[PDB]
Design a protein around this ligand. Sequence first.
Ligand SMILES: Nc1ncnc2c1ncn2[C@@H]1O[C@H](COP(=O)(O)OP(=O)(O)O)[C@@H](O)[C@H]1O
Lengths: 349, 16, 65, 203, 64
Amino acid sequence: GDEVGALVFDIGSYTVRAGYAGEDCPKVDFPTAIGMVYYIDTNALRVPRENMEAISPLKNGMVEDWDSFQAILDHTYKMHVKSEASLHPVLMSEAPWNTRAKREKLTELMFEHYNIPAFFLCKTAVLTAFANGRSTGLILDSGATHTTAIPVHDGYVLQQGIVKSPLAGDFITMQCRELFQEMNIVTRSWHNYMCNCVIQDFQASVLQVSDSTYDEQVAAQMPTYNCDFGAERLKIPEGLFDPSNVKGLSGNTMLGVSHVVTTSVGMCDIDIRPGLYGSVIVAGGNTLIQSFTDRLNRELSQKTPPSMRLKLIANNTTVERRFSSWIGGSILASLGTFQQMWISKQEYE
Amino acid sequence: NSEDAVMTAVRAWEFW
Amino acid sequence: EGEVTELTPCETENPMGGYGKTISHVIIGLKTAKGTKQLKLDPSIFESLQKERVEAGDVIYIEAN
Amino acid sequence: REERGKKEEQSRLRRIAASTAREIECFWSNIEQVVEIKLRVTSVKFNAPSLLYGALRDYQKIGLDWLAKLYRKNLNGILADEAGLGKTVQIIAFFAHLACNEGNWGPHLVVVRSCNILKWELELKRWCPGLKILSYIGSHRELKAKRQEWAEPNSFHVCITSYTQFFRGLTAFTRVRWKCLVIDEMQRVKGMTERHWEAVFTL
Amino acid sequence: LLREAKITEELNLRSLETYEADKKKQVHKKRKCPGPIITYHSVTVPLPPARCSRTFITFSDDAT
Ligand SMILES: Nc1ncnc2c1ncn2[C@@H]1O[C@H](COP(=O)(O)OP(=O)(O)O)[C@@H](O)[C@H]1O
């Protein structure tokens, strides 16, 4: 139970999490989108300065603009961490499947510019599994840029059974747009960013998932101007699980959350599928939708082989599910293996 | 039942 | 007896348990004046091999039973 | 040699990851164990056995049958049987049948002596477990926290109260409606000069 | 509904009251292990029924 004071970072697509190890809640949380003319903070989101382009370091779940990554890391170490970045280990949280070149570039940039004495990174599925308190399981993450069913066995991502669907930040940023326009309505990038923000607010406010196939529903009102929305709010979320249910705006084929889970479990080798089915874990931001986990559970039960247990984690009530990765990373640097299994300062040199 | 699968895997390893 | 050429063919962990690293057999390349003959002895003897200074290039006196 | 070296590198990475996973899982298990240790320490007879896990005896079932007339005919009588026959089990079976037959649960009350509160809730949990029961301790502070989920919600269907606690909170119990008011060992309720009579009358 | 709710609630209460494990102690022993533990393991395997004995030696880390 030794603690050295490591700063665990997690570069998310919607909000970056950061804070000292040994905490049960991310102390740092703010939008990750960088506004370059070069301001990265909630202030940047608020300040209406000269023409600004809204972009993010992550693209399809992979860091593309290293300049923005360096900028956000420096801004964090300067204002949020309020401590010099030369006497504190770092536990980076990469993507579900990171590449050799990306990890090499990250390690090189770190050890060169920041001179971190100890830098280590691990998968996100394993971190979430550790946060939930289980080694074997099936992580069902739905982030702002991708949703993936990551089967983990003994805290290691089974790269052979990974899957992915187009469910990303484009979930309702443009569907809810037309849904609202049905009744009625600094650069273009900033306008799109503000539109996405207000659409996410509308989502967290009224968007709800049904328990079964789409059906009539009473209306609900909410400000933005005020309007009363009928069952329209219950239509778009249907596309997350069943493609046949959404027949008009879901193309010809689509791997829903349930179908994604089934495919991920089927692609895995024998002797481990029972453990995966028994312990199913959900993650991401889209899981916060109302009645999401309920529909997921009551639907996966139908698409479940006989005598196969299905016991998920009932943590959706708490908002910390989205930060499960950060919780796992923080609790990771409080063990004895932190000194045994770790990358020191003279391993790469 | 688990022990049955375990011994079957052991027999498969022996054949290998 | 004969000049030893120790080598342990890596084998999958105990199939009855989990995974990892185990050794199911230990091959010793006893080389005699007439020729060479590798013996796939029991792995439990590995302790005896490490006990004495049994390095590649020396003569060892093995016992059947 | 090349392919075996590649496979061995992959297996070594797998094993390092598995060791880290085992370590973190063991630490989490220790934490959970510590948390759990700190937290823990002309007589129709047709009865339904649904939710009756505790096995009942023949005479117990017969007694249950004889007393079915009370709830069905809206009658009340005294149950004076020699100790050792488990009247608590009979009352538990009655509460279970009230739900097995009709869909009404209602909020119930059971008056038990101070030295018999734990025994009664233990028996309830043992015989016919499925029920919602609450205890009454700490009349000053603890009860105040428990009385914050009774008005609007039906947090519990059965309550195990004590005699001495009623007289200090009559203004509270008389507000909520109740269906069954069980009182055991009426020997303490045989003196008219006591104030318990008028206190329990207005229920 | 509320019926299954109360059932599960009292079942959990009964489990808690009855809990008044050896596997956990074995896991603790494992914790205390420095890590480079070599395990001598031999089990009977098939070729009473005809069978034979097989020997296995598991090495924790590559150092050993
Ligand atoms: N690349 C990613 N991988 C995993 N999770 C992500 C990723 N990007 C964003 N997330 C999480 O998903 C959430 C998406 O936000 P959103 O679902 O719109 O909020 P809400 O639905 O609660 O209104 C973000 O809060 C973010 O933390």
